Design a protein around this ligand. Structure first.
Ligand SMILES: [Mg+2]
Ligand SMILES: [Zn+2]
Ligand SMILES: [Zn+2]
Ligand SMILES: [Zn+2]
Ligand SMILES: [Zn+2]
Lengths: 66, 255, 34, 528, 98, 98, 115, 521, 44, 39
RNA sequence: UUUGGCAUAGUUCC
C-alpha cells in the first residue's frame, strides 16, 4: 500500500528511502547499486525496498467523496 | 566466589554505530547486556492519537500505527520524564508526555507528501530524527485533508517494539571455533568471520578443552532516537537497577 | 533468420503479445457477445 | 409427511434421540503446548468465564462461594447464578439487591469454570474410545485449546486449522465417573491391540536418539538445567562418568534419571546389523545398538521409535504395565521437557545441504538408469522380433509388462540403495529417518536419486490418445519415458511430460482418500 | 423475471419446474483475492453426481494436456469434477458451415 | 418492448466497453477488473461452463451386463434451432441366447 | 479478545510480591526462590554467578511457562553456608561487575572521542 | 489447411481432422470445442523467424500484434481431437536439431510447456520440484490468501472483505505472473523463515512468529463487514425510546442520530444497535439490527439511498483491524499450512552473527514426508536475490537454473553455499550446535482466523419444534453429540455421563401417564 | 442532518420522511458525514 | 489377483452368494503334490 | 429479552 516506516525483521527505518530509491533507479542505477548507495546493508532491509508494491499511487486516482 | 574485572575497547564510533569488545566477562552477563539493548532502554514514542479529520486514503488506525513508529529524539529528556502510570497528573502533563500536532491540507493539482517534517512538538528537544530525507506518513490528493493531536509517552521495548532504540545488535564470541560450540560437518565451506585470526589455509582453530567463552564482540546500531553510546550506558545502568531492586526485596523477605 | 538459443526471450515475447491481444476472460465476453 | 419426519437422518428418531445438541460445549482451534502435562488442556479465559458448574453450598466452602458471588459474573473467578432450595433462580449477571446474595447450606452456586476442572475433549470423527478422554482444565491467556503433543496420536490431530470439542460434566457423580474411567493416563494402553496408544512424537523422538548417542557429554551447568526440568528427581546429582580431567556426564546418565522405578527391558535400535547378535561383541555392540535397561538405568543403546514408540513391549509399555498410569504420565512429561530443553542446545534443521548427494553417487545413479533403459529397449526388441516367449498362466502382453516393470523396479531400488548408502553422519534426512520421527528411505530415495514409475489403476500410464500417451511421442512407444518412468529426482526437477504423468499419479491418491472415508464410516456404524 | 430468476438462484430452468432444473450454474463471484476472482471466472464443471463412487470421470485424462490445469482442483466431494482452464486455452464461439 | 435482458460487464453492450483506464477510474471502476459477470439485484453472478457429450457424432460403447453386446448412439441436434437432442441407439444383442 | 495487555509482563499488580522464599525438603540446605515478572535476562546472570561460588553445590533456574511471567531459582549450598547468603553475595558481585564495566566504558568513550 | 492459415474462407476457429486408417475427413464449425495455440514446423524449422520476433518486440507504435502473427500462418489453433493427428515438439532448439533420430516429421511445436498450468498454479515457484498433492493444495489455498483484492475497494459495500496492510511482490516469481497481475495486486509478504526446532511450539505443522516483527506491521490486515436494512404496517428508521416501544432489549440506543443511523467514525462494541427501525403495531415494535456479537469495530461508511420500489435503503460498513494472534493460519506457496503456535519478542528469537532474527520458525519435520523441495529452493533463490538486487526466476521448466548455480551465486556474497547459517540461542546467548537453514520465503496469511472460530455455550437459546439447543455459532447454538460419540461413550461405560449428555444437558421434560392405558393423561 | 452527495460532493439537509434526492445534480446516493465525536487511538 | 481391504470387508460383513473374485485353493494328496506330471 | 423456516452454493478438517 505505502512503504512501511520500519524494517520488519530488525527495525531500521526504511520509510524515508522510497522516493530516493525511485530517483536513483530513474537516474540509471541498478537495483543492487541503488540499495548499496542508500545504505541498506543486510538482506532483511534490502527486501523491504526490492519487493515493495506501491498501491497508494493507484488509490490516488479515484476522486475523494467530498 | 567474587566478581569479574571486565575491560572494554571501542573499535569504531560514529553517529549511528558503536563497535566494542568486552573481555573477562561471563557469557551470561554479555548476553544479558545484549538483551537489554533491545528491550529495556527507555525511549519516547507516540502512544495516543486523536484524529480530528482524516479524508485521506488510509484509515485512522493505519495512520496512527504509522505515527507510532516515527522515532523522536529522546537523547537527554528520557531520564527526566516519568511513566504516565507513575505520574500525579490526571491524563497528561508536560512532566510525563510530549504533545504533537499535525494539520495538513492539499489544495494543489500535485500529490502532496505528508512527512514527519510536519509533526510539531511543544518541547523543542523531542523532535523526529529527520528534523536535525523525511519519514513519509501519507500522500494526499486534491481536497484530501489530515489533522490530529498526538501524545508521546515514555516506555521500553518489552511493552511495544516502537520503543526499541536499536536497529541491529550484532553479537558474536569466539570467531574461530576453538571451543567447538558449533560443529561443522565440513569446516572448509564456511566463510571466516570478520575478526578471525587465521591464515588463508586453516579453517578452524585447534581445540581448546580448558577454555571458556570470553572476548565478546558487539556492534550496536541505533535507529536515531538515542545515540549509540547512551544506548550502551543506559543498558548497564538499566540492568544494574533491576538487580538492586531484587536485592532490596530479598532483604525484606529474609528478615 | 533462425532464432537459435535466443529462444527464451522470443517465446515470452510471443506469449506477452498473446495476452495483450486477448486477455484472461475472453471466453465469457466473446460467448455473450455472439 | 410423518413418515418423512421419521424416515432417516435429520429425522426425529436418528437425529434427535440417538444424537442431539447439548449445552456446556465449546469448540475452537487447537495449538501445541509442550509445557502441559499429558492429562491437561489449556482453555482461554473467555470460554471458562462463559461456562459454569453448579457447586452445592456446605460449611466447608460457604465462605469461598460467598466471595465468588461477591465477585459476580463480571470478574472471571466469579459466578453467574444462585439456585435456591425451592429451585427458583437468582441472576447475578446484572446488579442484584444485597438480600439475594445470602448463602445457606443446600444452595447451589453456578461458578465459572476454574483450574482443575474435569472436561471431556473430543475430535470428530470419533473412531475409537481414545477419541474422547478426560482432561484437567488450565486457564491460559490467548484463545486456543492448548494440548500436549503425545496426545496427538490418540486423536489423529495435527495443528493446521484443526478444531476439537469440549464437554463439561455438571454433577459430582458424572465427574467422578469421568475421573475414574476416561482420564487420559488411564487410556495409555489400548485394548484393541494391547499396545501403548500414545508415545513420543517426532521431535522429542528425533532428539532422544541424538541425546542417547555415545558422544553426548554434558557440562556441569547443562546438567544443572536439565535436572531443573525433572519433576521426579530425588535431589542428588549423580557422579559423572568422566571424572578427570574434567567432570562430564552423559546423555544416558540422565535418561537413567528420567526412567522410573526399577524397569528391566531389552530393545534393539533401528540400525542394528545382523552380525552383532551372532559373532563376537554380542554384549559390546560397537555401534551402540541393543538397548539395555537394568534396574531403571539406561546401561547401553540408542533410543528411537522402537523403544519409546507406540509398539508392543516398548519401554513405555513396560513402564505402564509395571508402574501404572500415574507414573507413566510423569514419564511422558519428563521425557518431553528434558529433551526439548536440551534440544535448545543441539538444534535441528533440514536443508538443501541435507538433500544433495555426491558426484560419485550421481555417476552411479546415472549409470544404473542408463543400464535399465538399455535393458528395457532390449526386451522391446525381442518382443518385436517375436522371440519373447510367454510365461505359463500369462498373456504375451502380461509377460512383457511384467518384465518391463520388474526391470524398472530393480533400477529404482538399486538407485535408492546407492542414495541411502552414500549419506553422511550429519545428514538431517538420516536423522529424521533413523530415529523414526518422520520420513522413510523411499522418501530419501525420491529426493536424491529417482522419483520412479507412475501408475494408474495399478497399470502403467494408459494410451489416452490414439495409440500414444501424449502428442509428443510416436505411436506405439513402450519405452520407459513414454509410459511414465520419471528418471529425475525432486532436486533436479521433472521434464514436462513427467510433470503431467506425476499429476496423473497423484490424482489417484487424492481420489482414494476422498472415496474410502464414507464407506469406512458406514462399515463401522453397521458393526456398532 | 425469467432471466433474472434463473441468474439469481442458479436453478437453470423455469421456477415452477425447479426440481429437475440443474442447480450450480450462476454462482456468486468470489472476491477474496484477485487470483480467486480470475480462477472463478475461468472455471468448468462436470455434471456427474458428486456422490458417485465410480471415479473414472474424476481422474486426469491424457487429453487434458494444455486444455485444463493438471493440478488446480477442489478436494472432497467434487475432486476431479470441477476444473479450471489452462493459461492459453480458448473455447470456440461457433459459426455456420456455409 | 418485450423485456429487459441482463448485460455482461465489459462486453460489447456495456457502458464500460472500450473506455480507457482514466475513464474507468472516473466511473469508480477498477481498471484491473477483468469483467465477464452479471449484476443481478446487486450481487455479482458468474456462469460456470457446463460439460456435455458432443452432439452429431456416432459413439460405440458397451454395457457391462445388459441385454445388448454393443451399443451406438448419435445425439442429434439441428444448428441450435430447437428439439435439443434425440439420442437414437442402434444396439446389438448378445451371444448368450437361450 | 483474550489478549493480555503488554504491560502485564513487567508490572506487579495489587497483591503480588516480587520474590518469595521457600525451602526444599528433599535435600538439606536447599532453597527455592520464586521471582514474579522476570525472565532469562535476570535468571541467567544469577545462575551463572551462583555457579562461580565454590560453596554452591546446585544452582539453576527455569521458566515454568512462556505465557506466564515467573522465574524459579533453586540453589543448594554446602553446610556452614546458606543459600540466602549465596544469593545476596551473587547479586552484590553482579552489581560490582556492572559498575566497573560502566566506568571503563565511559572512560573508553572519552578516550575515543577527542583523544 | 492452407485456406485456414491464410484466413481467407475458413475461420481460424474451424478444425479439420483426417483419420488416415479409417478414411474419413471431419470438419467442425461447432461452438464449445476447446483449443490452444501452437507453433507450426514446416520441414524441421519453425515458421517463426527473427523478423517476426523483432516486429513483435516493437509492438507499440507499430500496430503489429497477435492477429498479425496468426494471419501470417505462423501459429495455429489446435483443438483436442485434432491433436491426435499431430506430432508435437516440446522445445524447438532442442527437439528440431539433429540427434539420434527419434522423429524427423514434427508437425508443430509448443510455445512454452509451462502454459499447461492454470491461474492459481502459475504462482507456485519451482512446481516441478514439488509433489503433485502439494501443488493441488497450494492451488486450493491460493484463493484464501489475504491481499488487496481490487483497487476500488473503498466504494464497494461487500458483505465481507479482507485487505492486507503491506503486500509485497515475490522475490522469487514465475514468468507467467505478469499476465495474472500478481505484481500489481499481490497477497503475501516476504518473510525471513528459519527451519529449526526451537522450543517445541512449532511441532506438528505450527509456526513461531516474531512478536517484535508483528508490532511493526507484519501481516496485519483489516476486516470489513456490511449491514443492510430497508423500511418495507410502517417500518421507519427512527431512534427508539425505552418507555414507548413494545419490543426492547438490553442494548444501547444512544449511538444513533435523529433518523436512527450511526454516523461514521463511531466506535461500536459487540451487541450494539447500528440501524434503529420500528414497526407500528396495530403501539410500536422494535426491529433494530444489532452488531454480530463481539466485533468491536469502528463505523466506516454509511450510504443512504432508495431501492427499486422507492423505500429508503441503507448500507453500513464496519472495520476492525486484525493483528495476527496465536491461532491464525499461515501458509507458503508450497502447500505447507500451519497455525501460529506462540510469539516471541526479538530478544528471545535466535539470531545470526549480524542480528537477523527470523520472522517465522517452522519445524524441520514438515519436509521429509511431504517432499516440498521447491520450498527450500525458493528460500535459497530468495536469499540470493535479496543480496544481488534482482528478482529470481522460478518458471517451471528452465534448464538454466540449478541448485548448483544458485549455491555458487550465493557463495559470492559471503554466505554458506547451501544456505545454512550459524545461529545463537536467544535466551542463553550460546551458539546452537547445528547450523540452521534460514532465508527469505514468501508467506501468505489465510482467511481462517481464530476470532471467527472460537465458540462456547452454556444454557443459551433453544429450538422451537424439538426444544433442543439451536444450531449455529451465530445463533449461540450447541455442539452436536452424534451417534459416533454416543457409541464411544457406550464403549467407555460412562452410563451416567451418557445419560446426562443425551437427556439432562439437552432437553429435559416431564409427563404424566395412566397406569391402566399407557397414554399421557 | 447533512448528507453528502456521491456525485457532486455537495452536502444538503435532508430530514426524516423525505425522498433522498440531491439538488442541482439529481443523484440518488447520499453518504452520512463524519461524526464530531472524538475517538482515541493507541498508536500500536 | 483377488480383492482385499474395504471391498473385501464389505463382502465378508454382508455375505453375498456372488463374490467378486471367488477362489478355491486346492491341496494334493500324494505324488501329485511333488511330481509335476500328476499335478 | 427476546427467537422465522426451506432450498442451493462455496470452504475447513479427517
Ligand atoms: Mg490437519
Ligand atoms: Zn532490516
Ligand atoms: Zn503527568
Ligand atoms: Zn388410562
Ligand atoms: Zn449531487
Amino acid at each position: 500500500m505505502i512503504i512501511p516506516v520500519r524494517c520488519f525483521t530488525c527495525g531500521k527505518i526504511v520509510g524515508n528511502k522510497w522516493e530516493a530509491y525511485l530517483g536513483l533507479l530513474q537516474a540509471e542505477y541498478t537495483e543492487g547499486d541503488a540499495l548499496d548507495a542508500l545504505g541498506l546493508k543486510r538482506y532483511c532491509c534490502r527486501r523491504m525496498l526490492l519487493a515493495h508494491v506501491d498501491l497508494i499511487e493507484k488509490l490516488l486516482n479515484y476522486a475523494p467523496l467530498e | 566466589p567474587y566478581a569479574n574485572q571486565p575491560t572494554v575497547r571501542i573499535t569504531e564510533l560514529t553517529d549511528e554505530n558503536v563497535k566494542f569488545i568486552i573481555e573477562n566477562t561471563d557469557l551470561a552477563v554479555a548476553n544479558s547486556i545484549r538483551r537489554v539493548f533491545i528491550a529495556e532502554v527507555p525511549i519516547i514514542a507516540i502512544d495516543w492519537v486523536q484524529i480530528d479529520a482524516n479524508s485521506s486514503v488510509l484509515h485512522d488506525e493505519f495512520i496512527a500505527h504509522r505515527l507510532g513508529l516515527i522515532p523522536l529524539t529522546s537523547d537527554d529528556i528520557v531520564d527526566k520524564l516519568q511513566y504516565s502510570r507513575d505520574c500525579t497528573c490526571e491524563e497528561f502533563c508536560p512532566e510525563c508526555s510530549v504533545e504533537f500536532t499535525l494539520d495538513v491540507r492539499c489544495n494543489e493539482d500535485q500529490t502532496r507528501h505528508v512527512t514527519s517534517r510536519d509533526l510539531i512538538s511543544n518541547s523543542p528537544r523531542v523532535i523526529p530524527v529527520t528534523s536535525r530525507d523525511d519519514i513519509l506518513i501519507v500522500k494526499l490528493r486534491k481536497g484530501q485533508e489530515l489533522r490530529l493531536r498526538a501524545y508521546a509517552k515514555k516506555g521500553f521495548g518489552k511493552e511495544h517494539a516502537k520503543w526499541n532504540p536499536t536497529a541491529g545488535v550484532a553479537f558474536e564470541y569466539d570467531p574461530d571455533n576453538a571451543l567447538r560450540h558449533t560443529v561443522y560437518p565440513k569446516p572448509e565451506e564456511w566463510p571466516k568471520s570478520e575478526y578471525s585470526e587465521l591464515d588463508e589455509d586453516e579453517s578452524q582453530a585447534p581445540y581448546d578443552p580448558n577454555g571458556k567463552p570470553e572476548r565478546f564482540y558487539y556492534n550496536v546500531e541505533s535507529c536515531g532516537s538515542l545515540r549509540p553510546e547512551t544506548i550502551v550506558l543506559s543498558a548497564l545502568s538499566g540492568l544494574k537497577k533491576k538487580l538492586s531492586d531484587l536485592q532490596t526485596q530479598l532483604s525484606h523477605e529474609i528478615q | 533468420e533462425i532464432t537459435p538459443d535466443l529462444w527464451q526471450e522470443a517465446c515470452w515475447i510471443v506469449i506477452s503479445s498473446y495476452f495483450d491481444e486477448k486477455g484472461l476472460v475472453r471466453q465469457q465476453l466473446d460467448s455473450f457477445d455472439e | 409427511s410423518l413418515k418423512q419426519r421419521l424416515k432417516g437422518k435429520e429425522g426425529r428418531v436418528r437425529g434427535n434421540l440417538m444424537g442431539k445438541r447439548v449445552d456446556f460445549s465449546a469448540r475452537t482451534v487447537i495449538t501445541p503446548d509442550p509445557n502441559l502435562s499429558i492429562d491437561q488442556v489449556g482453555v482461554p479465559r473467555s470460554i471458562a468465564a462463559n461456562m459454569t458448574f453448579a457447586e452445592i453450598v456446605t460449611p466447608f466452602n460457604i465462605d469461598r462461594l460467598q466471595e465468588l458471588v461477591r465477585r459476580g459474573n463480571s470478574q472471571y473467578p466469579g459466578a453467574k447464578y444462585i439456585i435456591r432450595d425451592n429451585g427458583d433462580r437468582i441472576d447475578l449477571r446484572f446488579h442484584p439487591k444485597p438480600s439475594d446474595l445470602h448463602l445457606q447450606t443446600g444452595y447451589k452456586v453456578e461458578r465459572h469454570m476454574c483450574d482443575g476442572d474435569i472436561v471431556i475433549f473430543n475430535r470428530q470423527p470419533t473412531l475409537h474410545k481414545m477419541s474422547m478422554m478426560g482432561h484437567r482444565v488450565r486457564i491460559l491467556p490467548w484463545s486456543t485449546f492448548r494440548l500436549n503433543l503425545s496426545v496427538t496420536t490418540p486423536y489423529n490431530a495435527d495443528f493446521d486449522g484443526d478444531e476439537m470439542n469440549l464437554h463439561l460434566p455438571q454433577s459430582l457423580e458424572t465427574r467422578a465417573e469421568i475421573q475414574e474411567l476416561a482420564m487420559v493416563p488411564r487410556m495409555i494402553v489400548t485394548p484393541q491391540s494391547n499396545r501403548p496408544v500414545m508415545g513420543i512424537v517426532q521431535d522429542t523422538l528425533t532428539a532422544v536418539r541424538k541425546f542417547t548417542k555415545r558422544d553426548v557429554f554434558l557440562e556441569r551447568g547443562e546438567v544443572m538445567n536439565l535436572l531443573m526440568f525433572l519433576s521426579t528427581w530425588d535431589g542428588k546429582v549423580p557422579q559423572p562418568a568422566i571424572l578427570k580431567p574434567r567432570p562430564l556426564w552423559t546423555g544416558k546418565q540422565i535418561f537413567s534419571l528420567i526412567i522410573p522405578g526399577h524397569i528391566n527391558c531389552i530393545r534393539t535400535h533401528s540400525t542394528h546389523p545382523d552380525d552383532e547378535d551372532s559373532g563376537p561383541y554380542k554384549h559390546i555392540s560397537p555401534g551402540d545398538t541393543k538397548v539395555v535397561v537394568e534396574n531403571g538405568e539406561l546401561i547401553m543403546g540408542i533410543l528411537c521409535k522402537k523403544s519409546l514408540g507406540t509398539s508392543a513391549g516398548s519401554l513405555v509399555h513396560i513402564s505402564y504395565l509395571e508402574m501404572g498410569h500415574d507414573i507413566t504420565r510423569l514419564f511422558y512429561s519428563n521425557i518431553q521437557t528434558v529433551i526439548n530443553n536440551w534440544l535448545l542446545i543441539e538444534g535441528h534443521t533440514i536443508g538443501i545441504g541435507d538433500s544433495i548427494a555426491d558426484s560419485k553417487t550421481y555417476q552411479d545413479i546415472q549409470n544404473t538408469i542408463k543400464k535399465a533403459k538399455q535393458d528395457v529397449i532390449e526386451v522391446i526388441e525381442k518382443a518385436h522380433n517375436n522371440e519373447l516367449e510367454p510365461t505359463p498362466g500369462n498373456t504375451l502382453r502380461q509377460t512383457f509388462e511384467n518384465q518391463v516393470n520388474r526391470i524398472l523396479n530393480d533400477a529404482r531400488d538399486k538407485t535408492g540403495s546407492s542414495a541411502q548408502k552414500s549419506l553422511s553422519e550429519y545428514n538431517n534426512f538420516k536423522s529424521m529417518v533413523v530415529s523414526g520421527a518422520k520420513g522413510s528411505k523411499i522418501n530419501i530415495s525420491q529426493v536424491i536419486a529417482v522419483v520412479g514409475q507412475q501408475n494408474v489403476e495399478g497399470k502403467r500410464i494408459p494410451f489416452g490418445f490414439k495409440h500414444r500417451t501424449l502428442p509428443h511421442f510416436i505411436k506405439d512407444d513402450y519405452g520407459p519415458e513414454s509410459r511414465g518412468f520419471v528418471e529425475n529426482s525432486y532436486l533436479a526437477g521433472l521434464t514436462p511430460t513427467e510433470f503431467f504423468f506425476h499429476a496423473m499419479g497423484g490424482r489417484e491418491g487424492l481420489i482414494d482418500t476422498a472415496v474410502k472415508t464414507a464407506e469406512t464410516g458406514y462399515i463401522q456404524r453397521r458393526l456398532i | 423475471d425469467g432471466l433474472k430468476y434463473s441468474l439469481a438462484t442458479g436453478n437453470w430452468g423455469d421456477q415452477k419446474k425447479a426440481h429437475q432444473a440443474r442447480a450450480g450454474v450462476s454462482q456468486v463471484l468470489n472476491r477474496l483475492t484477485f487470483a480467486s476472482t480470475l480462477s472463478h471466472l475461468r472455471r468448468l464443471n462436470s455434471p456427474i453426481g458428486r456422490d458417485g463412487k465410480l471415479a473414472k470421470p474424476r481422474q486426469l485424462h491424457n487429453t487434458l494436456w494444455g486444455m485444463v490445469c493438471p493440478a488446480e482442483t477442489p478436494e472432497g466431494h467434487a475432486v476431479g469434477l470441477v476444473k479450471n482452464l489452462a493459461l492459453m486455452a480458448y473455447i470456440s464461439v461457433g459459426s455456420q458451415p456455409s | 418492448f418485450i423485456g429487459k435482458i441482463p448485460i455482461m460487464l465489459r462486453s460489447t453492450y456495456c457502458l464500460l466497453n472500450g473506455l480507457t483506464d482514466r475513464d474507468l477510474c472516473e466511473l469508480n471502476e477498477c481498471p484491473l477488473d477483468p469483467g465477464g459477470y452479471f449484476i443481478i439485484n446487486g450481487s455479482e453472478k458468474v456462469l460456470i461452463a457446463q460439460e456435455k457429450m458432443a452432439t452429431n457424432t456416432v459413439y460405440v460403447f458397451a454395457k457391462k451386463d445388459s441385454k445388448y453386446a454393443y451399443t451406438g448412439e448419435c445425439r442429434s441436434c439441428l444448428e441450435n434451432s430447437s428439439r435439443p437432442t434425440s439420442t437414437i441407439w442402434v444396439s446389438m444383442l448378445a451371444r448368450g441366447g437361450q | 479478545m483474550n489478549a493480555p495487555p503488554a504491560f502485564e509482563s513487567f508490572l506487579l499488580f495489587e497483591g503480588e510480591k516480587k520474590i518469595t522464599i521457600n525451602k526444599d525438603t528433599k535435600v538439606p540446605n536447599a532453597c527455592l526462590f520464586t521471582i514474579n515478572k522476570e525472565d532469562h535476562t535476570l535468571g541467567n546472570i544469577i545462575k551463572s554467578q551462583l555457579l562461580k561460588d565454590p560453596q554452591v553445590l546446585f544452582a539453576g533456574y527455569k521458566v515454568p511457562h512462556p505465557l506466564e511471567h515467573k522465574i524459579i531459582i533453586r540453589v543448594q549450598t554446602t553446610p556452614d553456608y546458606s543459600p540466602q547468603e549465596a544469593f545476596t553475595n551473587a547479586i552484590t558481585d553482579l552489581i560490582s561487575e556492572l559498575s566497573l564495566l560502566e566506568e571503563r566504558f565511559r572512560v573508553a568513550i572519552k578516550d575515543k572521542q577527542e583523544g | 489447411r492452407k485456406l485456414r492459415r491464410q484466413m481467407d474462407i475458413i475461420v481460424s476457429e474451424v478444425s479439420m481432422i483426417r483419420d488416415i486408417r479409417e478414411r474419413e475427413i471431419r470438419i467442425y464449425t461447432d461452438a464449445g470445442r476447446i483449443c490452444r495455440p501452437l507453433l507450426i514446423v514446416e520441414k524441421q524449422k519453425l515458421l517463426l523467424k527473427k523478423r517476426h520476433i523483432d516486429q513483435l518486440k516493437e509492438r507499440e507504435y507499430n500496430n503489429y500484434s497477435w492477429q498479425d502473427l496468426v494471419a501470417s500462418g505462423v501459429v495455429e489453433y489446435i483443438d483436442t481431437l485434432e491433436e491426435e493427428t499431430v506430432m508435437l515438439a516440446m522445445t524447438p532448439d532442442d527437439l528440431q536439431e539433429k540427434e539420434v533420430a527419434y522423429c524427423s516429421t514434427y508437425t508443430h511445436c509448443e510455445i512454452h510447456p509451462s502454459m499447461i498450468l492454470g491461474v492459481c498454479a502459475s504462482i507456485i515457484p519451482f512446481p516441478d520440484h514439488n509433489q503433485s498433492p502439494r501443488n493441488t493444495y497450494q492451488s486450493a489455498m491460493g484463493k484464501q490468501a489475504m491481499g488487496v483484492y481490487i483497487t476500488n475497494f473503498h466504494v464497494r459495500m461487500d458483505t465481507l472483505a479482507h485487505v492486507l496492510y503491506y503486500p509485497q511482490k515475490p522475490l522469487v516469481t514465475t514468468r507467467s505472473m505478469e499476465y495474472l497481475r500478481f505484481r500489481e495486486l499481490p497477497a503475501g509478504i516476504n518473510s525471513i523463515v528459519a527451519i529449526a526446532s526451537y522450543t517445541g511450539y512449532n511441532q506438528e505443522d505450527s509456526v513461531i512468529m516474531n512478536r517484535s516483527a508483528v508490532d511493526r506491521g507484519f501481516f496485519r490486515s483489516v476486516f470489513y463487514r456490511s449491514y443492510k436494512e430497508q423500511e418495507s404496517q410502517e417500518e421507519v428508521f427512527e431512534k427508539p425510546t425505552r418507555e414507548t416501544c413494545q419490543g426492547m432489549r438490553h442494548a444501547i440506543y444512544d449511538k444513533l442520530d435523529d433518523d436512527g443511523l450511526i454516523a461514521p467514525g463511531v466506535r461500536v462494541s459487540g451487541d450494539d444497535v447500528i440501524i434503529g427501525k420500528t414497526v407500528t403495531l396495530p403501539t410500536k415494535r422494535d426491529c433494530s439490527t444489532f452488531l454480530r456479537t463481539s466485533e468491536t469495530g469502528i463505523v466506516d461508511q454509511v450510504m443512504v439511498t432508495l431501492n427499486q420500489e422507492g423505500y429508503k435503503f441503507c448500507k453500513i460498513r464496519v472495520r476492525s483491524v486484525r493483528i495476527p494472534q496465536i491461532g491464525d493460519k499461515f501458509a507458503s506457496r508450497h502447500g505447507q499450512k500451519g497455525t501460529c503456535g506462540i510469539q516471541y519478542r526479538q530478544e528471545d528469537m535466535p539470531f545470526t552473527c549480524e542480528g537477523i532474527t527470523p520472522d517465522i520458525i517452522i519445524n524441520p519435520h514438515a519436509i521429509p514426508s511431504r517432499m516440498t523441495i521447491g520450498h527450500l529452493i525458493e528460500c535459497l533463490q530468495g536469499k540470493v536475490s535479496a543480496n544481488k538486487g534482482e528478482i529470481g526466476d522460478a518458471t517451471p521448466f528452465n534448464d538454466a537454473v540449478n541448485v548448483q548455480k544458485i549455491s555458487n551465486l550465493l557463495s559470492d556474497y559471503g554466505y554458506h553455499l547451501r544456505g545454512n547459517e550459524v545461529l545463537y540461542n536467544g535466551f542463553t546467548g550460546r551458539k546452537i550446535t547445528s547450523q540452521i537453514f534460514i532465508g527469505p520465503t514468501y508467506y501468505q496469511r489465510l482467511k481462517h482466523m481464530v476470532d471467527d472460530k472460537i465458540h462456547s455455550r452454556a444454557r443459551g437459546p433453544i429450538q422451537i419444534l424439538n426444544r433442543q439447543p439451536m444450531e449455529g455459532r451465530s445463533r449461540d447454538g450447541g455442539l452436536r453429540f452424534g451417534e459416533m460419540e454416543r457409541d464411544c461413550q457406550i464403549a467407555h461405560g460412562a452410563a451416567q455421563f451418557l445419560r446426562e449428555r443425551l437427556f439432562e444437558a439437552s432437553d429435559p421434560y416431564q409427563v404424566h401417564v395412566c397406569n391402566l392405558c399407557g397414554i399421557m393423561a | 442532518m447533512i448528507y453528502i452527495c456521491g456525485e457532486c460532493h455537495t452536502e444538503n439537509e435532508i430530514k426524516s420522511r423525505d425522498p433522498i434526492r440531491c439538488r442541482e445534480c439529481g443523484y440518488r446516493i447520499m453518504y452520512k458525514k463524519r461524526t464530531k465525536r472524538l475517538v482515541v487511538f493507541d498508536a500500536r | 489377483n483377488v480383492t482385499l481391504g474395504v471391498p473385501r470387508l464389505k463382502e465378508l460383513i454382508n455375505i453375498s452368494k456372488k463374490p467378486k473374485t471367488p477362489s478355491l485353493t486346492v491341496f494334493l494328496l500324494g505324488q501329485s503334490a511333488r511330481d509335476a506330471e500328476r499335478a
